[PDB]
């Protein structure tokens, strides 16, 4: 276990600059097609190629000093009940996160597309609750004895698959329900002891989502050490300029008041209320449209500065691709795709 200092969560996000996550990567899944992945299978199933240091060194270089690992643990997790980790999985995420963490970086490391299993419903619960403890155990036994530089994140973006408001706060089971898991994540990493006694900690709402039926219902969990818990809103916002493939690609002065009163949002549903936040997702897609992203970008930065909100962004390695284009690194050139839209969040 290595030395840490006793920080504050508010402390700790005083120390961020910025963050990038390293996107459709770890949290790859090939649940559909390929059972029982090795590690670089995964890796490399979304097309991305593997990662290096060189990679996070130029992430470095261009500004961000913090780092979100997302990760996909179901294709790389065995049967109920014992939920054991594949080994080699667990080692390869080892090896990316000190990838950060050798870097003097913030990592932030989590589970993520784990929706199969983890449901949110009062018939799920005592299950899901067991896994949760499972392999929450497991992963905070293995990075038990990492500083205060690195966060764990309990979950990603629960929600009720399917659900007419899947996207739109579910329902207020579901809600609840939540609350539970996010508290049982809490109990786990801190049972482990050590450094993970202190460590800070990451929670999202139903689906990472701020608005008022997720911001009514969220239950800040119980904690045995004082001020260590971070609250991650994902906001892709303005969501028909920044999320919707088929949405405008200009950015207006209405853009900006919209985005002026959907960061005030997440600043008193949260930090205004002694809860610190981060923006643990945000970006805005290839439109072809550089100028309008340059815009959005800067309004973006400022006004998340202006309530003292970090902010991430969801960097997939996709530039023209058939999908969501959130690409900022070339992975393949070692080079900024668009320098234009990284001077426009540095500035
Ligand atoms: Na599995």
């Given at each position: 276990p290595t030395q840490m200092r006793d920080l504050t969560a508010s402390q700790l996000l005083d120390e961020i600059t910025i963050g990038w996550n390293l996107g459709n990567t770890l949290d790859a899944t090939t649940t559909s097609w390929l059972p029982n992945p090795t590690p670089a299978q995964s890796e490399t199933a979304?097309?991305?190629?593997m990662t290096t240091k060189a990679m996070i060194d130029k992430v470095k270089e261009g500004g961000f000093n913090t780092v979100r690992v997302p990760v996909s643990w179901i294709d790389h997790t065995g049967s109920a009940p014992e939920y054991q980790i594949d080994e080699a999985w667990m080692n390869r995420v080892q090896e990316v996160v000190n990838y950060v963490i050798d870097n003097d970086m913030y990592c932030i490391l989590n589970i993520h597309h784990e929706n199969d299993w983890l449901i949110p419903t009062n018939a799920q619960k005592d299950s899901v609750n067991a896994r949760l403890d499972a392999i929450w155990t497991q992963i905070a036994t293995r990075f038990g004895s990492y500083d205060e530089h690195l966060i764990f994140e309990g979950m990603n973006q629960p929600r009720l698959v399917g659900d007419p408001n899947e996207w739109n706060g579910g329902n207020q089971e579901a809600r609840q329900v939540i609350n539970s898991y996010n508290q049982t994540f809490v109990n786990t990493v801190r049972a482990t002891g050590g450094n993970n006694a202190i460590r800070c900690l990451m929670v999202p709402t139903y689906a990472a989502s701020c608005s008022s039926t997720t911001v009514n219902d969220f239950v800040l969990p119980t904690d045995t050490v004082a001020n260590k818990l971070i609250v991650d809103i994902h906001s892709y916002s303005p969501y028909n300029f920044a999320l919707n493939t088929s949405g405008t690609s200009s950015f207006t002065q209405s853009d900006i008041s919209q985005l002026q009163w959907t960061l005030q949002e997440i600043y008193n549903s949260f930090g205004a209320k002694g809860i610190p936040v981060i923006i643990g997702q945000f970006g805005a897609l290839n439109k072809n449209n550089i100028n309008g992203r340059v815009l959005w970008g800067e309004n973006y930065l400022r006004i998340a500065k202006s309530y003292n909100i970090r902010c991430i962004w969801w960097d997939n390695n996709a530039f023209d691709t058939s999908g969501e284009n959130f690409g900022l690194l070339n992975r393949g050139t070692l080079?900024?795709?668009?320098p234009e839209l990284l001077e426009a969040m540095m500035k």
């Open positions: 979304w097309g991305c190629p080079t900024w795709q668009y």
